[PDB]
C-alpha positions as semicolon CSV with decimal commas, in nm:
position;residue;x (nm);y (nm);z (nm)
1;X;3,897;-1,693;-0,283
2;X;4,162;-1,485;-0,093
3;X;4,433;-1,647;-0,318
4;X;4,269;-1,471;-0,624
5;X;4,181;-1,100;-0,691
6;X;3,881;-0,930;-0,513
7;X;3,702;-1,053;-0,190
8;X;3,993;-0,865;-0,019
9;X;3,886;-0,762;0,335
10;X;4,188;-0,692;0,561
11;X;3,983;-0,558;0,857
12;X;3,693;-0,314;0,932
13;X;3,948;-0,039;1,034
14;X;4,112;-0,083;0,688
15;X;3,765;-0,036;0,530
16;X;3,710;0,275;0,750
17;X;4,069;0,394;0,668
18;X;4,017;0,411;0,288
19;X;3,655;0,525;0,353
20;X;3,743;0,819;0,587
21;X;4,015;0,968;0,360
22;X;3,811;0,940;0,032
23;X;3,491;1,077;0,198
24;X;3,638;1,398;0,350
25;X;3,833;1,480;0,026
26;X;3,524;1,404;-0,194
27;X;3,322;1,659;0,011
28;X;3,574;1,951;-0,015
29;X;3,623;1,858;-0,388
30;X;3,243;1,896;-0,455
31;X;3,250;2,229;-0,264
32;X;3,550;2,363;-0,459
33;X;3,385;2,260;-0,793
34;X;3,060;2,456;-0,720
35;X;3,235;2,774;-0,580
36;X;3,411;2,784;-0,925
37;X;3,130;2,667;-1,165
38;X;2,748;2,588;-1,120
39;X;2,671;2,220;-1,031
40;X;2,444;2,189;-1,342
41;X;2,721;2,093;-1,600
42;X;2,882;1,862;-1,337
43;X;2,769;1,504;-1,417
44;X;2,765;1,288;-1,101
45;X;2,758;0,978;-1,329
46;X;2,699;0,883;-1,696
47;X;2,351;0,766;-1,571
48;X;2,273;1,074;-1,347
49;X;1,937;1,169;-1,513
50;X;1,782;0,816;-1,489
51;X;1,917;0,768;-1,127
52;X;1,711;1,080;-1,031
53;X;1,400;0,940;-1,210
54;X;1,423;0,588;-1,050
55;X;1,468;0,766;-0,712
56;X;1,124;0,942;-0,756
57;X;0,961;0,623;-0,905
58;X;1,072;0,388;-0,619
59;X;1,061;0,674;-0,357
60;X;0,765;0,912;-0,456
61;X;0,788;1,026;-0,089
62;X;1,132;1,191;-0,153
63;X;1,037;1,392;-0,471
64;X;0,902;1,681;-0,254
65;X;1,150;1,977;-0,234
66;X;1,156;1,944;0,150
67;X;1,231;1,567;0,125
68;X;1,505;1,636;-0,139
69;X;1,686;1,906;0,069
70;X;1,731;1,720;0,402
71;X;1,724;1,386;0,578
72;X;1,829;1,265;0,924
73;X;2,062;0,967;0,994
74;X;1,790;0,783;1,201
75;X;1,534;0,768;0,910
76;X;1,802;0,585;0,702
77;X;1,897;0,366;1,004
78;X;1,548;0,206;1,022
79;X;1,526;-0,156;0,888
80;X;1,275;-0,052;0,616
81;X;1,508;0,221;0,474
82;X;1,827;0,001;0,490
83;X;1,645;-0,269;0,289
84;X;1,512;0,004;0,048
85;X;1,876;0,120;-0,016
86;X;1,964;-0,245;-0,103
87;X;1,660;-0,270;-0,345
88;X;1,775;0,071;-0,479
89;X;2,129;-0,075;-0,525
90;X;1,990;-0,388;-0,708
91;X;1,847;-0,143;-0,970
92;X;2,188;0,028;-1,031
93;X;2,417;-0,279;-0,977
94;X;2,389;-0,310;-1,360
95;X;2,546;0,037;-1,425
96;X;2,696;0,190;-1,105
97;X;2,995;-0,037;-1,026
98;X;3,144;0,163;-0,732
99;X;2,811;0,205;-0,542
100;X;3,002;0,140;-0,213
101;X;3,316;0,348;-0,287
102;X;3,259;0,564;0,025
103;X;3,142;0,929;0,025
104;X;3,067;1,221;0,264
105;X;2,713;1,369;0,205
106;X;2,545;1,655;0,397
107;X;2,218;1,581;0,587
108;X;2,064;1,912;0,466
109;X;2,139;2,062;0,121
110;X;2,128;2,424;0,245
111;X;2,349;2,329;0,550
112;X;2,733;2,350;0,556
113;X;3,009;2,084;0,602
114;X;2,965;2,035;0,982
115;X;2,958;1,710;1,192
116;X;2,578;1,720;1,268
117;X;2,487;1,871;0,927
118;X;2,667;1,576;0,751
119;X;2,635;1,192;0,752
120;X;2,858;0,911;0,616
121;X;2,696;0,735;0,310
122;X;2,783;0,523;0,003
123;X;2,819;0,660;-0,356
124;X;2,467;0,530;-0,450
125;X;2,293;0,731;-0,167
126;X;2,524;1,030;-0,245
127;X;2,434;1,041;-0,620
128;X;2,060;0,987;-0,549
129;X;2,020;1,291;-0,314
130;X;2,294;1,498;-0,491
131;X;2,154;1,485;-0,850
132;X;1,812;1,561;-0,692
133;X;1,942;1,869;-0,498
134;X;2,135;1,985;-0,809
135;X;1,820;1,988;-1,035
136;X;1,614;2,141;-0,748
137;X;1,894;2,405;-0,699
138;X;1,904;2,338;-0,320
139;X;2,290;2,333;-0,342
140;X;2,294;2,657;-0,551
141;X;2,427;2,864;-0,252
142;X;2,778;2,697;-0,274
143;X;2,838;2,886;-0,607
144;X;2,740;3,201;-0,405
145;X;2,996;3,131;-0,123
146;X;3,340;3,298;-0,072
């Protein structure tokens, strides 16, 4: 009920307002953190290890180094994948509260922070690919930047 707390949806542009600002800052924050210290000690969540494991259990297609590094927007935008991200959410709805907090994630791990080399995602999709890339060391090169 709009009279009570939560269920608060002002408009889609309001959703995209809070989303756009948090996403762009979250990206340059991640970048800054790695250029200082290696991504290994950086915990994405207090469930990061088991999020990685459930990602390779429910998606044994992704666990390949080449399927960990990069994705395209279109292969997420298929009905099958959208549903799969909802099933993937229903696993972590018990532990990851802010699954749809809004985050900027790069399409390819070894690609920079450019329009075509990045896509807009939720926190759940971010953590999934990010923890993966971190263990696989596909985002190692940020600690080697200047």
